[PDB]
Structure 1
Amino acid sequence: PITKEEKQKVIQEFARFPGDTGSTEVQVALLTLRINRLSEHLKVHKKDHHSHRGLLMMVGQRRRLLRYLQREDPERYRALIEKLGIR
């Protein structure tokens, strides 16, 4: 799964300020977490095609949020990418 407080750890870690749930940072972090799980899913289970489509979708969304975040604030983008190990 992702139990609620795994969720929490990621969020109450990644917020700009307390209370922020949906800012780009936090979104990409939740995305990432979920993506990494699904990737570890299809390391076994290569035959699960539908879940995989899901992954494609997740992925494409992260890239979109990054693409934005870079266009907006490069400082914070490099912050993010460094913190998560991506792109």
Structure 2
Amino acid sequence: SLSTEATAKIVSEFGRDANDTGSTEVQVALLTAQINHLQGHFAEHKKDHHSRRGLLRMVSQRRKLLDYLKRKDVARYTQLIERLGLRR
């Protein structure tokens, strides 16, 4: 889900304004939260098959976006992976 507030929270925490949500770095960070937003749901119920299908779909959007910013910028990539703690 990643409710409206927490989405509107991190954009104002990783970006210039709340309109920076369709900007790349926050586009990444909302999905990183999206994994953690669903980590509890897979800690339970063990059979939500279609629910995990959305998560695997997401991690590609994380990774495919992880290389576009990496492509245009080596340092913003190194910053984003340590501004949040991803890419291992």
TM range (shorter): 0.7 to 0.9
Structure 1 letter corresponding to 2:14: F
Q: Aligned residue for 1:13?
A: 13
Q: Aligned residue for 1:80?
A: 80
**Does the aligned pair in 1 maintain the 2:28–2:66 contact within 8 Å?**
yes
Q: Which structure features the higher share of helix residues?
A: 2
Unmatched runs of 5 consecutive residues or more in structure 1: none
Identity of aligned residues (%): 59
TM-score (norm. length: structure 1): 0.88
Deviations 1:5-40 (A, max 9, x none): 21111111111x333221110100111111111122
Between the two proteins, the alignment pairs up a number of residues equal to 86
Partner Cα distance (2:21, 2:84) in 1: 18
Q: Aligned residue for 1:25?
A: 25
Q: Aligned residue for 1:57?
A: 57
CA RMSD in angstroms comes to 1.4
Partner Cα distance (2:84, 2:31) in 1: 11
Structure 1 letter corresponding to 2:77: Y
Q: Hey, which bits of structure 1, 4+ residues long, moved more than 3 A?
A: none
Q: Aligned residue for 1:4?
A: 4
